[PDB]
Design a protein around this ligand. Structure first.
Ligand SMILES: [Zn+2]
Ligand SMILES: [Zn+2]
Ligand SMILES: [Zn+2]
Lengths: 978, 114, 66
């Protein structure tokens, strides 16, 4: 039966079950799994000779000795190794097996990591954090994240209007083959401004525009009805025909295929001398570089004619003002390249060079005539160092950034980051704005501020970037479901029938597209032939059914509403409550045809509801043909904006500011920080989970690695030291552990013997023997030249005693003063087998007059002054505030969410609960919070008679005080005075 | 206004003049095919271009979930109570905000503006 | 990581009420009753147990250095 008022808990069982299965870096991991399981193989098997199959081991390390031993990701982090698995191939000439060709970096916690199924116990026996999401590469010790680069969708015709130039309208189509053997090759089809407006086709590998009818005759459609039958599907449209009349004249001279092929080849990159050679050049340029996604063959010419006629027809529809010009910012028109596509593109080039060099080597030996010996002909470092370099460096620039490990939310928000490019496509669109189509799929709040505002984006929480598929099952089903090909039809039937595209390529026509869409949906809602991430749009007015199985279509799950009732019945919720010891997960809910994945251009044919409880209830009818439903409307927010409580009460500049400052709050950033020698870790002593918390924080693990402390905050003008954004801190609270922090820094040095002489060596320099430019102080070193853990190091004090031999000294000192304590001194050997040392020093950081603190409602302030407990304004119970903030900060920022967080936090601390600040609740007012605050004996609006701590006298106006979650921003002041 | 196509090579027939009788011919430029026209018009430019949009809208749009339905506008053809209104949204007639209705009963699809 | 001694605001020792709070929550007492049973009256002190995340219980999973 239906769920009528149990909805808000049904809503969140369905979301818990989503995040139990997927997680939050599922797009990274699914993309790398696809790469390493499908794309490496179909890359070697698309190499022209030969290499047979591909094996990939688990990440292994060989020492200077030589022995395959597994490397765990922590031993890779510490010793500065690359966490990479060897790639073996089978080559045939005899035949060889498992010929090692390179080493491929392994994304952590993906199917080929050694930490893939390990339980949380055996993740801790390897010193790995069970909450670490994985989804990054360990390359030379560094943890690298492949930012997901967004780009324009290929294979689709986009008709834009060239502002000026010489073209009134231009319809482009970036085409790329199935397995992207050769890069995309854009073709344009423009209509000149202003006989009449002639149409020209800007082909690849051709320097001049070509009349469109020339390109239709070069394909072998000599006549003139046999060129308009491909362009104008209804000849009784006299308005569209007179637009092609001016162009059937520019190509009046040329009436045969070969003179047209000559006309084209005369414009090529290499204008040959022979008419036959120019004809053959133009023949292969139209046969391989014009619309390759339609086909590359000797008979893909009546399909390229149909597709080029489609591009021309769609340019005419735009010029006639019969179809809207295409939006360059719409996200149906974009695709996100994740670690799978990026690395497969990076691996095509390196396998190409491996082939090139095995040929260049074996040729020498066998034209000499002795023998080739393939297995030393293989330079494995091609693949190895190519992948490793392009990941370690980021130059593919701005892909492959170092993973941000300041907070857990900073990390999770780095592994779900997009990147709108500001290249030529950023020059033509408005890429910095929030488009309507980002709804549910990119976070509207989370963006950087300054020079990259709106260019770097973040996924919403339930947004999933599709990983890719194969259209062959769909193509066979379509043929079997009475779809006529583009060869067995007469262009007289193509008129009132429905085009059927599959991945851009026009595949057929169908005469009943309603029944076909019903069938295809019913199949995708069972995962029979169509996987769940396959998009199926129907343009009813345009008469097309577009079907996408691409990789990079961002999508999101939505409840299905048949007629006007959810299909999510009460039994699905009852079975998901028992999600353990039942094996009923998210996938048993997808596969039950009750939840769908809708992508950004399938999302324009749907009629969403926000809530079942309101939207599909009979009333004065707005819409009564709803087809989907939001699970929860707060799943439109990203990871760092799911921390903000009551974000529907702040102004969006404040949600954006906080999204940016939730990535700077200290906290505990990962559980095994005790073994991680990062440079610069910040760890709060006593983090606290928020007392007013979003329901979307149960899945961000913010109760387990929280970043901040619940302060008691008074909004009051106390002594003027909270002037604009400054705050007044309790000095006694700060003495009792409030917002104290630890700051770790690691220093590495290696004992490299690079040249013959001039060897660097670890040794206590001071006044030993053969001294050079010994500086201040060298007495805390032990005799191996390394300081020992537990000694107190001050400013300009020596850490590692290295001498580069008559010996110069190249000792390591602390980074210009901090007076920490040496925490851990690990000694090992790098890849080269040289001695290697990482030394971590620890510095406690007590909040000070300069340190910056910020609320979850987006404004940050230094600490103006710190008064002890007896100087603070107290209550008639002795509750002195922890933070006093200025009143004149609140109004100007629209953060009523800050005052509602204090009010709800007071009720939660008194009631013994933890309050719900989920955005779109409607079961949480301010009146309902006030009527509960007035039950614990407080003023219903949170005011409280405070007394003056200096003179003891009441303060004439009652001060607004209550517990608010405060964050200690990573900035502070110890980092500037040293 | 329309295109005439030859009957031998199927290329386009261009207009020419018949002197000896002074009558408008349409003649192909790849053959000696000729055809005494019936139009006596060569070219028509409609600048104001009052267009019927009741002819561009296909009845299949009555299968759109995202389109607003109605009850106080019964189809005149079949008397079906429901309809599906929408606007033009076409660069030429985007100025006005006139509503078109498409009867929503199956097999009717009768369009009408009011 | 571990329960602070001394409520931050007032200074009352909450650092010996964590195992008692856990024991009273596993004996099915609502958190508002477990906190009244430990005698934590001011909300400043009740948020010290209400909003505490015991991370030293997760750091005791990694084996020591020796
Ligand atoms: Zn002719
Ligand atoms: Zn009707
Ligand atoms: Zn207290």
């Amino acid at each position: 039966e239906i769920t009528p008022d149990l909805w808000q808990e049904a809503c969140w069982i369905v979301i818990s079950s989503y995040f139990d299965e997927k997680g939050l870096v599922r797009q990274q991991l699914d993309s790398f799994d696809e790469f390493i399981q499908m794309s490496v193989q179909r890359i070697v098997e698309d190499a022209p000779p030969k290499f047979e199959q591909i094996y990939l081991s688990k990440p292994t390390h060989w020492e200077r000795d030589g022995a395959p031993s597994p490397m765990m990701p922590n031993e890779a982090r510490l010793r500065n190794l690359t966490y990479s698995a060897p790639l073996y191939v089978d080559i045939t000439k005899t035949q060889h097996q498992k010929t090692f060709i390179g080493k491929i970096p392994i994304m952590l916690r993906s199917t080929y990591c050694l930490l893939n199924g390990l339980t949380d116990r055996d993740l801790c026996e390897l010193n790995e954090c069970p909450l670490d999401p994985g989804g990054y590469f360990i390359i030379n010790g560094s943890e690298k994240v492949l930012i997901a680069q967004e780009k324009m969708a290929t294979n689709t015709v986009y008709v834009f209007a060239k502002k000026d130039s010489k073209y009134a309208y231009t319809g482009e189509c970036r085409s790329c083959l199935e397995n992207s053997s050769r890069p995309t090759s854009t073709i344009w089809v423009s209509m000149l401004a202003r006989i009449g407006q002639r149409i020209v086709a800007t082909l690849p590998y051709i320097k001049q525009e070509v009349p469109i009818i020339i390109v239709f005759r070069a394909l072998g459609f000599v006549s003139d009805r046999d060129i308009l039958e491909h362009i104008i599907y209804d000849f009784e449209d006299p308005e569209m025909m007179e637009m092609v009349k001016p162009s059937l004249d520019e190509a009046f001279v040329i009436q045969e295929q070969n003179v047209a092929l000559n006309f084209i080849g005369s414009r090529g990159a290499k204008p040959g001398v022979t008419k036959e050679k120019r004809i053959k050049y133009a023949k292969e340029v139209l046969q391989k570089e014009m619309l390759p996604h339609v086909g590359v063959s000797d008979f893909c010419e009546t399909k390229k004619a149909y597709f080029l006629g489609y591009m021309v027809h769609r340019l005419l529809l735009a010029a006639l003002g019969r179809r809207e010009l295409d939006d360059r910012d719409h996200y149906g028109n974009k695709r996100l390249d994740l670690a799978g596509p990026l690395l497969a593109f990076l691996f095509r080039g390196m396998f190409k060079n491996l082939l090139k060099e095995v040929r260049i080597y074996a040729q020498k030996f066998i034209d000499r005539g002795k023998d080739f010996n393939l297995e030393l002909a293989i330079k494995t470092r091609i693949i190895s160092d190519g992948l490793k370099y392009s990941l370690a460096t980021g130059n593919w620039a701005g892909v492959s950034q170092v993973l941000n490990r300041l907070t857990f939310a900073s990390t999770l928000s780095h592994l779900r980051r997009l990147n709108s490019p500001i290249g030529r496509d950023g020059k033509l669109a408005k890429p910095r704005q929030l488009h309507n189509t980002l709804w549910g799929m990119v976070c509207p709040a989370e963006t950087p501020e300054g020079h990259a505002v709106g260019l770097v984006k973040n996924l919403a929480l339930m947004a999933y970037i599709s990983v890719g598929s194969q259209p062959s099952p769909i193509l066979e089903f379509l043929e079997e479901w009475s779809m006529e090909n583009l060869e067995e039809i007469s262009p007289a039937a193509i008129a009132d029938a429905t085009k059927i595209f599959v991945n851009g390529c026009w595949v057929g026509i169908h005469k009943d597209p309603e029944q076909l869409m019903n069938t295809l949906r019913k199949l995708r809602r069972q995962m029979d032939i169509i996987v769940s991430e396959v998009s199926m749009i129907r343009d009813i007015r345009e008469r097309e059914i577009r079907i996408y199985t691409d990789a990079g279509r961002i999508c999101r799950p939505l409840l299905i509403v048949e007629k006007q009732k959810l299909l999510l019945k009460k039994r699905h919720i009852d079975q998901l409550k028992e999600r353990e010891y039942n094996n009923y997960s998210w996938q048993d809910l997808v596969a039950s045809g009750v939840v769908e994945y809708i992508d950004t251009l399938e999302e324009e044919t749907v009629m969403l509801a926000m809530t079942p409880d309101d939207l599909q209830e009979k009333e004065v009818a707005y819409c009564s043909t709803y087809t989907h439903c939001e699970i929860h409307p707060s799943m439109i927010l990203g990871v760092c904006a799911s921390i903000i409580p009551f974000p529907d009460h702040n102004q969006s500049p404040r949600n954006t500011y906080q999204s940016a400052m939730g990535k700077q709050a200290m906290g505990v950033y990962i559980t095994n920080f005790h073994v991680r020698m990062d440079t610069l870790a910040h760890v709060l002593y006593y983090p606290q989970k928020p007392l007013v918390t979003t329901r979307s924080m149960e899945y961000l693990r913010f109760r387990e690695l929280p970043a901040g402390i619940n302060s008691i905050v008074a909004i009051a003008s106390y002594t003027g030291y909270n002037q604009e954004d400054s705050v007044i801190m309790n000095r006694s609270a700060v003495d009792r552990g409030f917002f104290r922090s630890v700051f770790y820094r690691s220093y590495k040095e290696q004992e490299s013997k690079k040249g013959f002489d001039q060897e660097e060596v670890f040794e206590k320099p001071t006044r030993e023997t053969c001294q050079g430019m010994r500086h201040a102080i060298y007495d805390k070193l032990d005799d191996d030249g390394l300081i020992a853990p537990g000694v107190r190091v001050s400013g300009d004090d020596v850490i590692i005693g290295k001498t580069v031999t008559t010996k110069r000294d190249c000792s390591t000192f602390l980074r210009t003063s901090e007076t920490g304590i040496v925490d851990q001194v690990m000694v090992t050997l790098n890849q080269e087998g040289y001695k290697f040392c990482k030394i971590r020093v620890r510095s406690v950081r007590i909040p000070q007059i300069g340190d910056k603190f910020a609320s979850r409602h987006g404004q940050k302030g230094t600490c103006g002054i710190q008064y002890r407990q007896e100087d603070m304004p107290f209550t008639c119970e002795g509750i002195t505030p922890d933070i006093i903030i200025n009143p004149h900060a609140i109004p100007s920022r629209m953060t009523i969410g800050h005052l509602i967080e204090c009010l709800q936090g007071k009720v939660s601390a008194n009631k013994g609960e933890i309050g719900d600040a989920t955005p779109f609740n409607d079961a949480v007012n301010v009146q309902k919070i006030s009527n509960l605050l007035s039950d614990y004996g407080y003023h219903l609006r949170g005011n409280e008679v405070l007394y003056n701590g200096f003179t003891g006298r009441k303060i004439t106006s009652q001060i607004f005080i209550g517990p608010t979650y405060y964050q200690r921003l990573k900035h502070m002041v110890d980092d500037k005075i040293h | 206004v329309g295109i005439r196509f030859c009957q031998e090579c199927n290329n386009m027939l261009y207009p020419k003049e018949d002197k000896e009788n002074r009558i408008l011919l349409y003649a192909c430029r790849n053959c000696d095919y000729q055809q005494e026209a019936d139009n006596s018009c060569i070219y028509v430019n409609k600048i104001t271009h009052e267009v019927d949009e009741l002819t561009q809208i296909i009845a299949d749009v009555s299968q759109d979930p995202t389109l607003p339905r109605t009850e106080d506008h019964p189809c005149q053809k079949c008397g079906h109570k429901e309809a599906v209104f929408f606007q033009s949204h076409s660069a030429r007639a985007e100025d006005a905000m006139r509503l078109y209705y498409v009867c929503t009963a199956p097999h009717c699809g009768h369009r009408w503006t009011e | 990581m571990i329960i602070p001694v001394r409520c931050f605001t007032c200074g009352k020792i909450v650092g010996n009420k964590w195992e008692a709070y856990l024991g009273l929550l596993q004996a099915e007492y609502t958190e508002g009753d477990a906190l009244d049973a430990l005698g934590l009256k001011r909300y400043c002190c009740r948020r010290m147990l209400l909003a505490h995340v015991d991370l030293i219980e997760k750091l005791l999973n990694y084996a020591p250095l020796e």
